[PDB]
Amino acid sequence: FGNSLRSKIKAYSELERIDFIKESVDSLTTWMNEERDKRIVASLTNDF
Amino acid sequence: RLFSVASQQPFRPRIKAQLTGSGVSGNTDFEANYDNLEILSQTIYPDA
Amino acid sequence: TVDAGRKSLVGVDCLLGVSKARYQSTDGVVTPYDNQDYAVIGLVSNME
Amino acid sequence: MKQKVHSVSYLAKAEFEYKNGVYDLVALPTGAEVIKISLEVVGLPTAGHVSVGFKDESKKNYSSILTLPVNETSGVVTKDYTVKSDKIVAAEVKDALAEGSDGRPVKCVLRALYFLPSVIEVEY
Amino acid sequence: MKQKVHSVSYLAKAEFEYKNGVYDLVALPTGAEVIKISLEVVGLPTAGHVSVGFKDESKKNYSSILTLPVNETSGVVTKDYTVKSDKIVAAEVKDALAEGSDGRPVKCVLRALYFLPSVIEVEY
Amino acid sequence: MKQKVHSVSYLAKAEFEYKNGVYDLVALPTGAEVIKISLEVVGLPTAGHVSVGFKDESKKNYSSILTLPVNETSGVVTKDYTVKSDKIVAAEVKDALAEGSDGRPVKCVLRALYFLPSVIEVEY
């Protein structure tokens, strides 16, 4: 499983002051962590 | 213009036309509007 | 280089196997462990 | 067998809340190949018409291409369009009051599938 | 003029052999933009109906959206759909016997053109 | 939920000038997933029919799939097609004289939206 993010044109990225590589890496690490944890919880709380 | 063709074979000079196509504006992908590089040719045949 | 080099794409992917421990008998004989969650008991309550 | 084809296609989806007014739903580029326009009414209207059509970015060039009364609640344009300076898909509702028979507000969804003016050469 | 549009589109084609049963034809993601569903009957049926509709991956949430009797042998859904947990396009044939009038088995083909939930921003 | 879908789609647009003859409008590959054929008449014809259909690259395998008289000036094929050796979309006009009622020549535009035979695997 995974995600991805696509940026805007580099001119806009440097114009609205987003460093898309770093922000995307951080936010996707976050999303991945909650995805693994939800996997664990969903398997754990499956049929009892 | 005297063409330096010494092979006396029928010659064909080519020219590259100016791009008259609109581009893409802002975040829009290049793919949304590709331009067409047009080449124009003319052939010169000998006469005896 | 997703548009032509203008934009970018940051993707994150994980391959992971997760399962609630539930051991099946390697033969036909009945053991108190067969279709039973190894170490899990459910607790259900009206949330509000 | 060799030709030039449009290889890039977009879908634009826009909602408005079905009461009198004019809404600018979809923006199209010059040379866009509009191949599907679909309008949908989510809810139970009691009275009114929705007219979708084309208009300029600025000037008052509105002209309905699909009219929807209350009853059928869904429609699709019967015609295909190449965008020639009419770069706004717009929708107007001239008659409409509050939701009616439901208590929940009535929605209208417009989906526009169009191909970009760019072409590429392919032989089969 | 600036908007977000769906730039990714897929077509799923699936065949079944037109006799009583339920078939899970097309799988759709959440947020998919289903813009065309078409059903076709290849052959000469003698008796029966085909109902295509939406149902859950697991639970029994079937609801017909297009019904086809024997005669017309082709149909298209009149409505457009955003996938909200009903992630199976399914087709059921309640009445059908052997091919009939042909000796060669009767086919049904379903084509689903849908746009992926992903969006991109474009200004024209 | 896992399937194979066609992820590549093209639109071919071709014009002809609406007088008697046969025109080879769109070329399709084997296995192409033809999902929309639309024909449009730009102008005011006075007499004649346009028949669009499929034919071979070489041999005389023409068979009309959509016939358009003068009055309605627009049409769409009601059926979906997988290209099996009939790799030419063609249009013939058997009856037609000069423009009529306008002084400006009558155009016909055919747009063919089709999906390429390539497939990819996706699970949702």
Method used to solve the structure: cryo-EM
Percent of chain B as helix, strand, coil, to the nearest 5: 5, 15, 75
- Asked if B36's CB is within 8 angstroms of D116's CB, the reply is no
Q: What is the DSSP string of chain D?
A: -EEEEB--EEEEEEEE--SSEEEEEEE--TT-EEEEEEEEEES---S--EEEEEE-SSS---EEEEEE-TTT-EEE-SS-EE-SS--EEEEEESS--S--SSSS--EEEEEEEEE-S--EEEE-
E strand or H helix that includes residue F112? strand F107-115
Cα within 13 Å of Cα(D38), Cβ side: 21
CA distance B18 to chain C (A): 22
- Asked if B29's CB is within 8 angstroms of D117's CB, the reply is no
Give the 3-state secondary structure of F8-49: CEEEEEEEECCCCEEEEEEECCCCCEEEEEEEEEECCCCCCC
Question: What is the distance between the alpha carbons of residues F78 and E68, in angstroms, rounded to a whole number?
Answer: 14
Identify whether the C-beta of residue F10 lies closer than 8 Å to the C-beta of residue E19. Answer: no
Which of C3, C8, C13, C41 should be substituted to probe chain A, the one whose Cβ sees the most A Cβ atoms within 10 Å? C8
List, in sequence order, every residue forming a beta bridge with E34; answer none if it has no partner.
E81, E114
Identify whether the C-beta of residue E91 lies closer than 8 Å to the C-beta of residue E110. Answer: yes
Q: What is the resolution of this structure in A?
A: 3.0
Residue E124's closest chain B neighbor by CA? B25
Q: How many helices (H) and strands (E) does chain E have?
A: 0, 11
Angle (CA) D65-D96-D55 rounded to 5° is: 30
Q: Which residues of E touch F (CB under 8 A)?
A: 8-14, 26-30, 36, 38, 40, 57, 74, 76, 87-88, 109, 111, 113
Q: Whose structure tokens read 């969903």?
A: A42
